[PDB]
PDB file of C-alpha atoms in Angstrom:
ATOM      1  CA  UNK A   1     -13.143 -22.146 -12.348  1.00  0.00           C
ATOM      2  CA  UNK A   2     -10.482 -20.059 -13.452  1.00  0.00           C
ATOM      3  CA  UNK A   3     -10.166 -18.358 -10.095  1.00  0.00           C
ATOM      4  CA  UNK A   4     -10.013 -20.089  -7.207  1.00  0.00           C
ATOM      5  CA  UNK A   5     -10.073 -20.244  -3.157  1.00  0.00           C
ATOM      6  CA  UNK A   6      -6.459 -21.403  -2.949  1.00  0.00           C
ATOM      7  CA  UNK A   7      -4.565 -20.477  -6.106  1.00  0.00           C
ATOM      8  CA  UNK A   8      -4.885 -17.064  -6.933  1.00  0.00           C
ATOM      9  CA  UNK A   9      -6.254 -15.885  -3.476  1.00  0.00           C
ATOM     10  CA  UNK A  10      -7.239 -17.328   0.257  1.00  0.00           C
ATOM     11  CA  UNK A  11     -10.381 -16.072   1.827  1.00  0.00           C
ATOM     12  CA  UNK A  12      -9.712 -14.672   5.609  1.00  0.00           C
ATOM     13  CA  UNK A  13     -11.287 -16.900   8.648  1.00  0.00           C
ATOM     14  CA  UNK A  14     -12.906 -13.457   9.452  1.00  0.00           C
ATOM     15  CA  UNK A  15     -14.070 -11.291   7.313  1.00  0.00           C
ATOM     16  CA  UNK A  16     -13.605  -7.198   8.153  1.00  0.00           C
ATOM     17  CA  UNK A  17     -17.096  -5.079   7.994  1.00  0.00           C
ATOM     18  CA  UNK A  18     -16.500  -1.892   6.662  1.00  0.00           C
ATOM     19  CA  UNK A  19     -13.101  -2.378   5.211  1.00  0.00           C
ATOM     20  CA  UNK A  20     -11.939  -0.932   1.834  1.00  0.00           C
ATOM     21  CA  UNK A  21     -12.782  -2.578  -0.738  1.00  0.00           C
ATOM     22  CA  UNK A  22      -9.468  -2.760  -2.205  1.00  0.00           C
ATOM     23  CA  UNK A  23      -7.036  -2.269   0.527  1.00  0.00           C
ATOM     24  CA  UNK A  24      -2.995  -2.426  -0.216  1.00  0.00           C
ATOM     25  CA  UNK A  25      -0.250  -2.737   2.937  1.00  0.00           C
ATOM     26  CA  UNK A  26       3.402  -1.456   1.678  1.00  0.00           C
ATOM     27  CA  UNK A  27       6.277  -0.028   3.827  1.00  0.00           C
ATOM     28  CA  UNK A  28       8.927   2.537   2.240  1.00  0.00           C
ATOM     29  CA  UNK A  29      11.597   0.213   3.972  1.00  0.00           C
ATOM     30  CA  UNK A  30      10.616  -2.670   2.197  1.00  0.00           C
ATOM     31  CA  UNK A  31      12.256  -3.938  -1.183  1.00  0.00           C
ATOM     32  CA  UNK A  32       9.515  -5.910  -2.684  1.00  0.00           C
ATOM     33  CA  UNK A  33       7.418  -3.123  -1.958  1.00  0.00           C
ATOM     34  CA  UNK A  34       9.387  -1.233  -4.342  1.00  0.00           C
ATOM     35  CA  UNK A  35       9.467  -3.536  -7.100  1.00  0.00           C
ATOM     36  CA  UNK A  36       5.549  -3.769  -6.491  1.00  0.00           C
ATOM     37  CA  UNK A  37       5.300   0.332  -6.942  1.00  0.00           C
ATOM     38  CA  UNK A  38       8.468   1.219  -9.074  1.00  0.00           C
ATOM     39  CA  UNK A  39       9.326  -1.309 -11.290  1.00  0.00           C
ATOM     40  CA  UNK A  40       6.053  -3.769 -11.912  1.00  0.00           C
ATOM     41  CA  UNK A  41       3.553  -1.093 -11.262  1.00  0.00           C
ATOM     42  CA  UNK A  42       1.084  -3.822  -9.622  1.00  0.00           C
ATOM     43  CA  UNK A  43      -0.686  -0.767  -8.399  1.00  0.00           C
ATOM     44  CA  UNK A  44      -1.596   1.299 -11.112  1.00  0.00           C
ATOM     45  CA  UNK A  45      -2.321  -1.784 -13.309  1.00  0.00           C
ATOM     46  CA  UNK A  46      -4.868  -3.324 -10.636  1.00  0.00           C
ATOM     47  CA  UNK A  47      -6.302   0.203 -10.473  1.00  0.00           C
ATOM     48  CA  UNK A  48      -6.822   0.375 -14.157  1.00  0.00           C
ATOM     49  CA  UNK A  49      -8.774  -2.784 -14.345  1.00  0.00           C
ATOM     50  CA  UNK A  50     -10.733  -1.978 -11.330  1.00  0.00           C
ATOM     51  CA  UNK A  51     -14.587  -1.752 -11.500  1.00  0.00           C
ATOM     52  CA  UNK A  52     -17.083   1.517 -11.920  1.00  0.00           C
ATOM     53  CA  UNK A  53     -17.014   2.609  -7.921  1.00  0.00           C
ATOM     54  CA  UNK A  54     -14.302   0.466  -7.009  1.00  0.00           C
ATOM     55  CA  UNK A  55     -11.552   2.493  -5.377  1.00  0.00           C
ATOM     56  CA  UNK A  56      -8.443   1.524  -3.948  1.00  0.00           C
ATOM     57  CA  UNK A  57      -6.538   2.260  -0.945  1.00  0.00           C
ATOM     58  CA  UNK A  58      -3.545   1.837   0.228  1.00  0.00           C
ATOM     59  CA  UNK A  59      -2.153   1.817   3.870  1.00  0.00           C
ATOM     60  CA  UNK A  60       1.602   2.067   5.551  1.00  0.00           C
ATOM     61  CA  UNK A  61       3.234  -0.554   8.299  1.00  0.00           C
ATOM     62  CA  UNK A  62       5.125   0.610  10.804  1.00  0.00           C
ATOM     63  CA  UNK A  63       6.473  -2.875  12.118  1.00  0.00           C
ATOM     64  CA  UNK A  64       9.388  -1.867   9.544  1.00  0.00           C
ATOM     65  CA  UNK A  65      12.234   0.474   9.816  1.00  0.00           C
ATOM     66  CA  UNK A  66      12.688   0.612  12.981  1.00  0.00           C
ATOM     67  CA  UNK A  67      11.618   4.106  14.561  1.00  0.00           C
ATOM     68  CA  UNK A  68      11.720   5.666  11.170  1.00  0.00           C
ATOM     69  CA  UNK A  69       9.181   3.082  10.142  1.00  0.00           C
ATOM     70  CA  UNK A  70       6.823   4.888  12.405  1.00  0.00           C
ATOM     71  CA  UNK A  71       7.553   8.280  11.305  1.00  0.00           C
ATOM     72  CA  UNK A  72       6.913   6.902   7.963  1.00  0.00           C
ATOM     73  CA  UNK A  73       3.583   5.635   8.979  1.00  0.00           C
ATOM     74  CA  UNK A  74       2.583   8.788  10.180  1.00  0.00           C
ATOM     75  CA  UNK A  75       4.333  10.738   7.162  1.00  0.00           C
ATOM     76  CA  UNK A  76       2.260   8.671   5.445  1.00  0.00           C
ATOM     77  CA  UNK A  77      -0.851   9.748   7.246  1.00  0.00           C
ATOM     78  CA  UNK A  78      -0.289  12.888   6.391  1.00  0.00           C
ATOM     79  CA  UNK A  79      -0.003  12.425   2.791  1.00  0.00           C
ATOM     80  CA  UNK A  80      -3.538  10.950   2.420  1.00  0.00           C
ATOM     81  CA  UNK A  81      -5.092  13.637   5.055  1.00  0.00           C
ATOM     82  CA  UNK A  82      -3.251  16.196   2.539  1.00  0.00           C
ATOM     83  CA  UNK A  83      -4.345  14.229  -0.521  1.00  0.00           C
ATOM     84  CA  UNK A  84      -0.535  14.331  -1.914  1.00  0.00           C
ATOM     85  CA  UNK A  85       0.033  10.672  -1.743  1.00  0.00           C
ATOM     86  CA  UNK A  86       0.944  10.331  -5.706  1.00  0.00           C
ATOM     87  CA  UNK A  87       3.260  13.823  -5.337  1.00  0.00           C
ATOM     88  CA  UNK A  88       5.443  11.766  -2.407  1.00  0.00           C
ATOM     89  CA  UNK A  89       4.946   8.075  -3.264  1.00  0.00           C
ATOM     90  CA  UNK A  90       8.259   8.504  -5.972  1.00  0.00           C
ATOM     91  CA  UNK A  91      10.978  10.575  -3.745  1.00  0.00           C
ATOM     92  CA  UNK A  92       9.797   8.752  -0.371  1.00  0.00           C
ATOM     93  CA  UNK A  93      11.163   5.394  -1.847  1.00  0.00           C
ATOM     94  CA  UNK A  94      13.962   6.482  -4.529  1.00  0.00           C
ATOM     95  CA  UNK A  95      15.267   8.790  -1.173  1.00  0.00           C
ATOM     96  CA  UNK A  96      14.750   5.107   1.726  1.00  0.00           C
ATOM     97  CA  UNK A  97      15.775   2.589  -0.515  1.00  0.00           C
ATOM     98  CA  UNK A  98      18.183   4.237  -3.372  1.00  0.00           C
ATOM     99  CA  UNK A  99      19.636   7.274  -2.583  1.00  0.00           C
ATOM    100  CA  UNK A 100      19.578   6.792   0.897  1.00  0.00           C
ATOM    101  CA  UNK A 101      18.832  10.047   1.472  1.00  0.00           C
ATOM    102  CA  UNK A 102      15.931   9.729   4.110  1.00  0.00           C
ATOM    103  CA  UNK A 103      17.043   8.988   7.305  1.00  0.00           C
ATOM    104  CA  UNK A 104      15.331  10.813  10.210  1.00  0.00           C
ATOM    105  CA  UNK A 105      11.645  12.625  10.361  1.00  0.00           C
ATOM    106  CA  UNK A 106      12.588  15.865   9.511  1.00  0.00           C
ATOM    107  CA  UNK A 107      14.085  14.375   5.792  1.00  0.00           C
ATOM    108  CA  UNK A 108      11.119  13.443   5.634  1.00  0.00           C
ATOM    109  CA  UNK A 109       9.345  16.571   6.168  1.00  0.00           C
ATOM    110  CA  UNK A 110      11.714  18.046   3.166  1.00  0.00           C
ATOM    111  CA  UNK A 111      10.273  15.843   0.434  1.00  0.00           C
ATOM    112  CA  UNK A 112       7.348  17.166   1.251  1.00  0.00           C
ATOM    113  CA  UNK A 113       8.451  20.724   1.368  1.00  0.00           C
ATOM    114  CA  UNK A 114       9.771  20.341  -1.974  1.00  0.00           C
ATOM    115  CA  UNK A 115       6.964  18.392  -3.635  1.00  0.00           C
ATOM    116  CA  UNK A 116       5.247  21.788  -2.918  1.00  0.00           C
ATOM    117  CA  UNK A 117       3.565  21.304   0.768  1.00  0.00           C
ATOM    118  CA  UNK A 118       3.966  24.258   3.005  1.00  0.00           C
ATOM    119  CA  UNK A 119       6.277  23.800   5.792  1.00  0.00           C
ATOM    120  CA  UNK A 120       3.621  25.739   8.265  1.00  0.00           C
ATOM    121  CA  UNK A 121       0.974  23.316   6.815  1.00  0.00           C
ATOM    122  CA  UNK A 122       2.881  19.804   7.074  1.00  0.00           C
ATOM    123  CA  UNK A 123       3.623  20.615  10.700  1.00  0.00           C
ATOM    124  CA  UNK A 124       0.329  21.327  11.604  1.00  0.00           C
ATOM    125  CA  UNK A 125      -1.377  18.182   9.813  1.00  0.00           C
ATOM    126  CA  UNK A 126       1.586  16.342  11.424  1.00  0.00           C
ATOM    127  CA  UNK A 127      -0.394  17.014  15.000  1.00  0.00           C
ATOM    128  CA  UNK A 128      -3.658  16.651  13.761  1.00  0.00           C
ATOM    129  CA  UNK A 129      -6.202  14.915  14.837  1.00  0.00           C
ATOM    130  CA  UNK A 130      -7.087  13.348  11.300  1.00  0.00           C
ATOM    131  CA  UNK A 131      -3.460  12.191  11.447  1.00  0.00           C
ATOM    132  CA  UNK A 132      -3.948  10.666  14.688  1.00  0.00           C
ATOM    133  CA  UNK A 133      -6.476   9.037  13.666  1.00  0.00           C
ATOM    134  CA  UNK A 134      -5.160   7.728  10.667  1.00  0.00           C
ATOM    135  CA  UNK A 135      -2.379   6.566  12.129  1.00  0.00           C
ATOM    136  CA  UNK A 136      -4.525   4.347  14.041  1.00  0.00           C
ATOM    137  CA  UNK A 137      -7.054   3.672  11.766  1.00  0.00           C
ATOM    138  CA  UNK A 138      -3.653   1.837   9.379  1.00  0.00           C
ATOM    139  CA  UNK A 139      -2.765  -0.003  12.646  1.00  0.00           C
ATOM    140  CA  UNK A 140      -6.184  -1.455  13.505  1.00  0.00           C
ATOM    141  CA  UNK A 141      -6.566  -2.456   9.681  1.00  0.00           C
ATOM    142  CA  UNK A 142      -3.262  -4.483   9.962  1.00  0.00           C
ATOM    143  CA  UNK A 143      -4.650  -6.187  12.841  1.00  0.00           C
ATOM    144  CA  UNK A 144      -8.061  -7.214  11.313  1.00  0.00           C
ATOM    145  CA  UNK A 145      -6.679  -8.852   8.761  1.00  0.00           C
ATOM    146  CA  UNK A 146      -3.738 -10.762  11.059  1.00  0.00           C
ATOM    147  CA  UNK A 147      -1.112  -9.529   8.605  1.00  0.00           C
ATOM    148  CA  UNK A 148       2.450 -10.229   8.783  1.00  0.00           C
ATOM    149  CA  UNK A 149       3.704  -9.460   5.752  1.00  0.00           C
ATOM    150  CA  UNK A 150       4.236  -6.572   2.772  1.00  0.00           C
ATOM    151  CA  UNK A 151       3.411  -6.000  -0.181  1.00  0.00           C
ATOM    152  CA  UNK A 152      -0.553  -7.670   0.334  1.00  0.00           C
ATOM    153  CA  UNK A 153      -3.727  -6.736  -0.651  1.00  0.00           C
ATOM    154  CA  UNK A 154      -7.189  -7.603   0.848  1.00  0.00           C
ATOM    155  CA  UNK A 155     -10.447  -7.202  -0.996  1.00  0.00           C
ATOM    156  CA  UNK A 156     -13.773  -6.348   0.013  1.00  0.00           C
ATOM    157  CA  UNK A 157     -12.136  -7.466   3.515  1.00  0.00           C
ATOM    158  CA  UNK A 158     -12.573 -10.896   2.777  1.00  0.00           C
ATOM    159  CA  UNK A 159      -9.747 -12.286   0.295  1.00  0.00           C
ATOM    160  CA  UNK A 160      -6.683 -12.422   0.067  1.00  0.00           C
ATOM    161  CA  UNK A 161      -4.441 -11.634  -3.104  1.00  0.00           C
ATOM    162  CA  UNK A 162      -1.958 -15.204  -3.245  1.00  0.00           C
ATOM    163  CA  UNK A 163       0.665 -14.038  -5.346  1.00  0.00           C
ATOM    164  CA  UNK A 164       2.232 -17.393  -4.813  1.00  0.00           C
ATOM    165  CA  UNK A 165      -0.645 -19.413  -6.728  1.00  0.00           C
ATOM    166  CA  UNK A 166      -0.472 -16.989  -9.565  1.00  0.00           C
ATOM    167  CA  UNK A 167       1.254 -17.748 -13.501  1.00  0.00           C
ATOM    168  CA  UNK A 168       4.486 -16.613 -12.795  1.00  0.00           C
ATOM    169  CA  UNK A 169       6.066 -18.100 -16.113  1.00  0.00           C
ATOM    170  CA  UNK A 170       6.445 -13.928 -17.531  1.00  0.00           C
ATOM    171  CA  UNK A 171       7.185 -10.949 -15.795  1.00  0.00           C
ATOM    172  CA  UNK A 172       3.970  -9.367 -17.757  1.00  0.00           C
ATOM    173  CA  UNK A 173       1.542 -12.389 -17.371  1.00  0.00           C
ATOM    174  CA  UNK A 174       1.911 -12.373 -13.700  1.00  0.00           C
ATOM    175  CA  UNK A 175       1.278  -8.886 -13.565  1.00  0.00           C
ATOM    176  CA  UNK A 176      -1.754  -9.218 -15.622  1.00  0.00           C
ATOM    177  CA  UNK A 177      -2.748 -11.817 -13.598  1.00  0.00           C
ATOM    178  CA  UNK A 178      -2.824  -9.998 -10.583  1.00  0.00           C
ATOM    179  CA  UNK A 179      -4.723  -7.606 -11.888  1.00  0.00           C
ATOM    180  CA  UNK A 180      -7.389  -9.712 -13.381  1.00  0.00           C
ATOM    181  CA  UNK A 181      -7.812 -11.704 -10.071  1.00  0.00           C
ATOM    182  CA  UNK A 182      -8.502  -8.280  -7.958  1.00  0.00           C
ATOM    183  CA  UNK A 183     -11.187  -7.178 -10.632  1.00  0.00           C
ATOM    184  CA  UNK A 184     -12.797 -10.621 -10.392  1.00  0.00           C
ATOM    185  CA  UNK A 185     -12.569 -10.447  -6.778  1.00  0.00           C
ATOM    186  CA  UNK A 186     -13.982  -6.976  -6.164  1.00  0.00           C
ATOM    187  CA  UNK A 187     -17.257  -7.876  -8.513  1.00  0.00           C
ATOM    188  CA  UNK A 188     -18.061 -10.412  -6.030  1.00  0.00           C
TER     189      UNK A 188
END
């Protein structure tokens, strides 16, 4: 076939009920991860080739970074309890990995100050217990699907995107390619 278990993407030894059924693990403290958002987009071009009803979701690791790693995580929690994840995504990564500007929790809590979040209101979703929650809920995913390493993406909580078996002979056909593989996966 033109995509198959091996090349383009493995298939897990266990598949996860109830998973998303596009699920994406990044860390702000990791560089591929920012050529993956920033500079190739993978993202936004898998999303635009995704399916009617086929959403996409995308979850933080806090295994990097050290203690601000965890922060992140939770930072990150907040973000999707708030719904703000694509007012944040940009300054969290331009201000961990090029500017350098993010270094403790309460950086962190300016970016989102200034993308327009209420100071009152980030502290409080901070402590919630949707936060909480989500914090764990990011963990537990992680675990489910024995990962290891970022940027990955799982679908339908069964495959696994294999970057590695992809055509990676042009910046733009690999891209594609990825794209392509996660909409065939996803109608399956």
């Amino acid at each position: 076939a033109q995509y198959e278990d091996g090349k383009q993407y493995t298939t897990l030894e266990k598949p996860v009920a109830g998973a998303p059924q596009v699920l994406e693990f990044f860390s702000f403290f990791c560089p591929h991860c920012y050529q993956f958002e920033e500079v190739l987009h993978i993202s936004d071009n898998v999303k635009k080739k995704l399916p009617e009803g086929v959403k996409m979701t995308k979850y933080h690791v806090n295994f990097m970074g050290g203690d601000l790693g965890k922060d992140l995580t939770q930072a990150w929690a907040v973000a999707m309890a708030l719904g703000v994840e694509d007012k944040v995504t940009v300054p969290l990564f331009e201000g961990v990995q090029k500017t350098q500007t993010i270094r403790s929790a309460s950086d962190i809590r300016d970016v989102f100050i200034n993308a327009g979040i209420k100071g009152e209101e980030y502290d409080a979703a901070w402590n919630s217990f949707v936060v909480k929650s989500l914090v764990a809920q990011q963990e537990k995913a992680a675990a489910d699907v024995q990962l290891r390493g970022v940027p990955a993406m799982f679908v339908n909580g069964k495959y696994q995107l294999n970057p590695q078996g992809m055509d990676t002979s042009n910046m733009d056909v690999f891209v594609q390619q990825y794209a392509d593989t996660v909409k065939y996966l996803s109608e399956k």
